[PDB]
Amino acid sequence: SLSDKDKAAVRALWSKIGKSADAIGNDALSRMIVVYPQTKTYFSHWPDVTPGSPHIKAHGKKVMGGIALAVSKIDDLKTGLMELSEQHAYKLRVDPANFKILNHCILVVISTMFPKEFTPEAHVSLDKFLSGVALALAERYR
Amino acid sequence: SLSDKDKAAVRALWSKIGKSADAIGNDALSRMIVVYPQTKTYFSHWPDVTPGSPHIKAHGKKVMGGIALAVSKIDDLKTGLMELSEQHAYKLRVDPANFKILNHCILVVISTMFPKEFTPEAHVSLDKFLSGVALALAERYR
Amino acid sequence: VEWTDKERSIISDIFSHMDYDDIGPKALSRCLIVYPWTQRHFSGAIIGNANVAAHGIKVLHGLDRGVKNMDNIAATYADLSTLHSEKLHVDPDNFKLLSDCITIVLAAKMGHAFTAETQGAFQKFLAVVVSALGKQ
Amino acid sequence: VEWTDKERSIISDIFSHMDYDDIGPKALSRCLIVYPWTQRHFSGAIIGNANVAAHGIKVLHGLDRGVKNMDNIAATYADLSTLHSEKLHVDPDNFKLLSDCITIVLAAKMGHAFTAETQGAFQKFLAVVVSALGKQ
Numbered sequence: 001s002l003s004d005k006d007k008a009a010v011r012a013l014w015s016k017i018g019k020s021a022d023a024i025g026n027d028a029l030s031r032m033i034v035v036y037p038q039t040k041t042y043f044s045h046w047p048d049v050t051p052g053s054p055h056i057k058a059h060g061k062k063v064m065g066g067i068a069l070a071v072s073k074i075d076d077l078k079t080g081l082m083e084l085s086e087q088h089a090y091k092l093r094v095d096p097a098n099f100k101i102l103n104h105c106i107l108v109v110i111s112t113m114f115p116k117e118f119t120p121e122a123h124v125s126l127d128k129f130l131s132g133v134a135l136a137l138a139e140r141y142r
Numbered sequence: 143s144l145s146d147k148d149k150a151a152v153r154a155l156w157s158k159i160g161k162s163a164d165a166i167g168n169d170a171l172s173r174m175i176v177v178y179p180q181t182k183t184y185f186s187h188w189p190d191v192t193p194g195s196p197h198i199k200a201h202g203k204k205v206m207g208g209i210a211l212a213v214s215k216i217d218d219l220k221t222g223l224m225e226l227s228e229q230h231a232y233k234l235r236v237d238p239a240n241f242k243i244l245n246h247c248i249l250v251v252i253s254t255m256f257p258k259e260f261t262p263e264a265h266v267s268l269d270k271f272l273s274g275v276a277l278a279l280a281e282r283y284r
Numbered sequence: 285v286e287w288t289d290k291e292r293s294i295i296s297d298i299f300s301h302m303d304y305d306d307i308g309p310k311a312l313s314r315c316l317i318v319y320p321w322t323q324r325h326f327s328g329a330i331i332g333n334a335n336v337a338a339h340g341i342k343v344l345h346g347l348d349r350g351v352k353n354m355d356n357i358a359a360t361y362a363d364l365s366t367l368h369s370e371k372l373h374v375d376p377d378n379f380k381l382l383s384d385c386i387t388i389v390l391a392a393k394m395g396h397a398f399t400a401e402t403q404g405a406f407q408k409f410l411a412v413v414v415s416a417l418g419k420q
Numbered sequence: 421v422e423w424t425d426k427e428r429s430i431i432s433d434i435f436s437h438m439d440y441d442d443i444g445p446k447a448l449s450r451c452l453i454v455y456p457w458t459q460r461h462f463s464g465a466i467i468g469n470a471n472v473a474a475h476g477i478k479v480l481h482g483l484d485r486g487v488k489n490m491d492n493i494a495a496t497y498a499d500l501s502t503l504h505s506e507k508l509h510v511d512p513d514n515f516k517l518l519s520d521c522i523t524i525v526l527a528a529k530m531g532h533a534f535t536a537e538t539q540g541a542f543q544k545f546l547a548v549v550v551s552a553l554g555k556q
């Protein structure tokens with residue numbers, strides 16, 4: 001669970017990072033697809049499932065919007081993300097093992113764009129935060 | 143997280159299985175050490191650390207004592223196992239990766255002993271319950 | 285991978301005393317119930333569904349294959365591997381799950397004859413088999 | 421494992437422009453701060469400790485050894501595997517964790533040059549190297 005130091009760590013980082021949220025979501029989502037082909041299935045209904053693609057660029061905005069939401073509801077991720085859990089488990093039926101993957105890709109992207117910002121200390125708290133998000137999202141699977 | 147039905151399933155099961163707790167802990171501890179050698183080191187301070195051993199047997203009792211505890215504190219595992227967590231992290235310094243391993247061995251043994259009561263339904267709930275237990279034990283590592 | 289004769293002996297012995305029509309459906313039934321999200325490959329009750337029962341049996345027959353080619357596993361499944369990924373779109377994590385379910389069901393039938401040594405050998409086998417499956 | 425010429429080029433490119441004294445220490449410091457339980461292997465702030473910086477360097481050199489023998493990787497590490505396994509008491513899981521840290525530190529070094537294709541190659545290489553290490 002996140003401590004006060006963790007919650008503060010994430011808010012401080014997010015305030016420097018938030019402006020590039022859409023860049024991060026697109027790059028991250030592109031990487032995931034290329035590096036972990038197994039995740040290409042879920043976006044197969046899109047015409048262009050490649051790095052440039054307008055759908056990827058569009059969806060990346062939404063994924064980061066979800067993260068922005070998680071940041072606001074940090075004190076209670078489970079209830080803040082209930083609906084999204086519901087949606088991924090029943091409507092999209094997204095295998096839960098993939099949340100670990102995307103989280104990894106986002107950390108890499110943030111590292112790529114904010115190397116001076118992403119210190120080991122920020123890293124620990126952001127990883128704890130992202131795990132909690134992954135955990136909140138699996139809530140409604142079983 | 144555990145639902146009302148998940149909680150009643152675990153209690154119902156524990157009510158039937160509880161009497162063999164000591165036997166379950168001994169067998170489960172033996173399998174872990176054997177099937178996953180990497181875990182032997184934490185118990186090297188014991189003279190004899192083999193299936194039959196009296197130290198394994200004594201410790202299989204405390205482990206299951208811990209499960210019985212979690213069962214009691216099932217409404218809030220995090221605060222209910224704050225102690226065991228603090229202990230395995232700073233005192234014993236056990237790698238958190240191993241809790242899933244012990245959980246798996248406990249499941250096997252229960253199938254071995256109570257094949258008639260360990261139904262798929264019981265299995266779902268006991269599994270979520272053990273994931274919760276492992277999650278709470280990992281609580282004080284970072 | 286390296287195999288000891290003792291291991292070759294247990295893995296082989298395990299599979300000859302096993303009734304496939306029995307272990308197959310129960311192992312798959314359980315996985316579909318304990319890990320609900322794998323059910324989306326059989327959308328086209330669970331414990332009684334014949335389609336699930338049938339694939340459970342096919343699973344055991346495919347494992348039996350690798351038992352006959354222990355020193356040539358990755359090659360033995362290259363075909364099955366591409367089927368579950370290329371066409372079936374099965375997440376490789378799912379093999380890990382079905383693996384544990386088979387262990388648990390087998391553990392309930394062999395009872396106390398399912399020793400820690402038997403367990404270790406059988407898990408090592410599935411580990412290698414799962415690697416060849418989620419690799420391609 | 422199967423390597424393409426492209427992958428051979430990319431990994432070679434990365435390791436020939438890498439600065440071991442910088443990446444090494446940073447990658448180990450991060451791992452010990454992000455995954456505190458690995459710290460029990462250096463029983464004697466973390467980012468400034470010379471003994472940490474030292475093994476960090478050793479790790480990268482140990483990898484470089486693998487870059488030269490991309491086709492005979494399992495053999496190449498067999499010894500180092502036993503070192504960490506039998507004597508140091510390293511949980512195999514700790515290798516996969518360090519693996520991620522190395523990737524993250526490298527990404528912050530190459531910035532926009534750490535394209536998705538580069539990540540793919542670098543991760544696949546660490547994967548093979550981690551299996552070898554957590555096998556003996």
Ligand code: HEM
Binds near residue numbers: 039043067
């Ligand atoms: C960091 C965790 C994640 C967040 C915050 C997230 C967020 C979202 C949001 C906000 C939507 C919105 C669609 C709408 O407007 O209703 C969505 C859709 C979707 N997500 Fe996720 N998601 C996450 C992880 C994943 C993963 C790991 C996958 C699978 C590789 C996935 C697959 C999908 C799919 C397939 C859709 C439907 C897209 C479409 O057809 O338009 N998501 N997600």
Ligand code: HEM
Binds near residue numbers: 226240
């Ligand atoms: C189902 C999760 C687990 C539970 C509930 C549990 C519970 C306990 C309890 C109750 C003690 C007794 C100490 C005391 O009263 O002060 C203990 C000790 C210990 N545990 Fe665990 N444990 C779990 C998992 C593990 C794992 C996975 C490992 C190692 C791979 C481990 C290693 C140890 C060691 C080495 C000791 C000290 C033995 C001794 O010298 O007496 N435990 N544990």
Ligand code: HEM
Binds near residue numbers: 322364372378379417
């Ligand atoms: C333990 C590893 C597994 C083995 C050895 C195995 C084996 C097989 C075989 C032999 C077929 C028959 C295809 C044909 O006629 O050419 C098949 C089909 C299929 N498998 Fe698997 N499988 C395994 C795991 C899985 C998993 C984990 C899933 C996801 C729950 C899955 C889902 C399917 C589906 C949807 C089909 C096609 C339907 C059918 O013909 O029954 N399989 N599998």
Ligand code: HEM
Binds near residue numbers: 474503515
């Ligand atoms: C990316 C995989 C790794 C590689 C390639 C690697 C490589 C090496 C090498 C080359 C040595 C020196 C050998 C000698 O003195 O004979 C060494 C020592 C050691 N390694 Fe690692 N290592 C790796 C991962 C790890 C991990 C994950 C840990 C756990 C934090 C670890 C802990 C140790 C310890 C405790 C020593 C002895 C310390 C010392 O230098 O005095 N290593 N390693």
